[PDB]
Amino acid sequence: CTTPTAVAVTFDLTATTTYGENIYLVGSISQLGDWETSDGIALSADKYTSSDPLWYVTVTLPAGESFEYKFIRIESDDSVEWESDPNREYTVPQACGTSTATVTDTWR
Ligand SMILES: OC[C@H]1O[C@H]2O[C@H]3[C@H](O)[C@@H](O)[C@@H](O[C@H]4[C@H](O)[C@@H](O)[C@@H](O[C@H]5[C@H](O)[C@@H](O)[C@@H](O[C@H]6[C@H](O)[C@@H](O)[C@@H](O[C@H]7[C@H](O)[C@@H](O)[C@@H](O[C@H]8[C@H](O)[C@@H](O)[C@H](O[C@H]1[C@H](O)[C@H]2O)O[C@@H]8CO)O[C@@H]7CO)O[C@@H]6CO)O[C@@H]5CO)O[C@@H]4CO)O[C@@H]3CO
Ligand SMILES: OC[C@H]1O[C@H]2O[C@H]3[C@H](O)[C@@H](O)[C@@H](O[C@H]4[C@H](O)[C@@H](O)[C@@H](O[C@H]5[C@H](O)[C@@H](O)[C@@H](O[C@H]6[C@H](O)[C@@H](O)[C@H](O[C@H]7[C@H](O)[C@@H](O)[C@@H](O[C@H]8[C@H](O)[C@@H](O)[C@@H](O[C@H]1[C@H](O)[C@H]2O)O[C@@H]8CO)O[C@@H]7CO)O[C@@H]6CO)O[C@@H]5CO)O[C@@H]4CO)O[C@@H]3CO
């Protein structure tokens, strides 16, 4: 191991913003409130040049336990859209050697 226990997970959600919004990844953990997209995981068009139509993402979750992973597409007009259908639960372990994995999803 090393010392820190941050879980950098890369998520890739295929959606489409309107040049001004964010597709959220709220998980049930403090770094991932999951129930407050405020501290979830926003995916955007970073490489993309528009706003965030395929909304990719690469954030971290420092804990090493079970965190929920509900997704909520944040928008520019109304607000979010908690896609609570395709949900998950990243049970990040406390061990080391793999404190970062993937988290794929897509809007439909
Ligand atoms: O059905 C979903 C599909 O619908 C369309 O959505 C566009 C819409 O067509 C258009 O009106 C657009 O206009 C604004 C937009 O925000 C800007 O991107 C741009 O609009 C055009 C632009 O003028 C064109 O040059 C066009 O060229 C392409 C370019 O490679 C790139 O822009 C591409 O999309 C970029 C996004 O950053 C990224 O998401 C990804 O695109 C893929 C996404 O995964 C899909 O969600 C997306 O579906 C949309 C399309 O955006 C569009 O057809 O398209 C791709 C997969 O289908 O790659 C790029 C990252 O660099 O989009 C072009 C496709 O060859 O780009 C857009 C048209 O896409 O100027 C406007 C701002 O003033 O708004 C919507 C928003 O997507
Ligand atoms: O006004 C915006 C608030 O809602 C957020 O946006 C949406 C979000 O998806 C959700 O809140 C929902 O509204 C309610 C939902 O329909 C209910 O199903 C329920 O959700 C439950 C879920 O199963 C899940 O989230 C789970 O998670 C726990 C979490 O693990 C706890 O830590 C914590 O527990 C309590 C606790 O009292 C306290 O932490 C409190 O603190 C606030 C927190 O910041 C958010 O929950 C906030 O919600 C707003 C948020 O900003 C929007 O992004 O308000 C909380 C204060 O009430 O959180 C809870 C609530 O007391 O949170 C939960 C609960 O233990 O548990 C929840 C709840 O049991 O509740 C949802 C909220 O009422 O839809 C929103 C938009 O439609």
CATH number assigned to the domain covering 1-108: 2.60.40.10
Residue 10 exposed, middle or buried by CB count within 10 Å (0-12, 13-18, 19+): middle
- The full length of the chain comes to 108
Q: Which of 23, 49, 50 to mutate to test the pocket of ligand 1 (most atoms within 8 A of CB)?
A: 50
Domain boundaries along the sequence of the chain: 1-108
Method: NMR
Residue 107 exposed, middle or buried by CB count within 10 Å (0-12, 13-18, 19+): middle
Return the ligand number nearest the Cα of 36: 2
CA distance 52 to 18: 8
